[PDB]
Design a protein around this ligand. Structure first.
Ligand SMILES: N=C(N)c1ccc([C@@H]2Cc3ccccc3B(O)O2)cc1
Length: 222
């Protein structure tokens, strides 16, 4: 996350860290003791999910670990266009809940007009380095028209755009699958965006979670 700052250790209990080959690949969202919601482009071999983490460089008393039993990619995910970029991860071991491990409620209502959001993760910071401490930033939901102009013919109804014209607060490499939180509900998933990271002109693109209400439930019920 570029142009943000360290999160408060207690303000992100739903945050997941996804590892592959000994390094952080993506973020994720705990939405159920058995399920982490992430981006479909985060599918990599032998994913290890870490819950209750704040500082990646140190073993913490609150952290929990789990292998993936089943990675469920949306049937209509299109890798070339990033459309329907959502994946459900079934945890091998259900998450042991505490004050630092809790699921985030999803936004079911597509009509919701809360523009004031926040992003978080352990992705590349302004200096081009990967932080050990989780980063936060307040960003705003950009218009469909503004996004459509920034990325011609690449924005679908399954995508949301959020940024900050003021300082260019954006998600970055390593923040993918992570949350876009609006009104203490999951509004989006870090999907893709401008390179180098920065939303001063071209906003960050997020999977639009409200559209997947039915598929999520149907997957968890299976
Ligand atoms: N809004 C942006 N500027 C933005 C955010 C996240 C990404 C990557 C995409 C990715 C690809 C492959 C593996 C992981 C990721 B991810 O963590 O972030 C790229 C751009």
């Amino acid at each position: 996350l570029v142009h943000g700052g360290p999160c408060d250790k207690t303000s992100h209990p739903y945050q997941a860290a996804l590892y592959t080959s000994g390094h952080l690949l993506c973020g994720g969202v705990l939405i159920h003791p058995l399920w982490v919601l992430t981006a479909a482009h985060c599918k990599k071999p032998n994913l290890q999910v870490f819950l209750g983490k704040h500082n990646l460089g140190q073993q913490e008393s609150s952290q929990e670990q789990s292998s993936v039993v089943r990675a469920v990619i949306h049937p209509d995910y299109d890798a070339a266009s990033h459309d329907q970029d959502i994946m459900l991860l079934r945890l091998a071991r259900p998450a042991k809940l505490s004050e630092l491990i809790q699921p985030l409620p999803l936004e079911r209502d597509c009509s919701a007009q809360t523009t004031s959001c926040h992003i978080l993760g352990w992705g590349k910071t302004a200096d081009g380095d990967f932080p050990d401490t989780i980063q936060c930033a307040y960003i705003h939901l950009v218009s469909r028209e503004e996004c459509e102009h920034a990325y011609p013919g690449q924005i679908t109804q399954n995508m949301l755009c959020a940024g900050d014209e003021k300082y260019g607060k954006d998600s970055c490499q390593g923040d993918s699958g992570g949350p876009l939180v609006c009104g203490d509900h999951l509004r989006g998933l870090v999907s893709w965006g401008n390179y180098p990271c920065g939303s001063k002109e071209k906003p960050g693109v997020y999977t639009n979670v409200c559209r997947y209400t039915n598929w999520i439930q149907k997957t968890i019920q299976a």
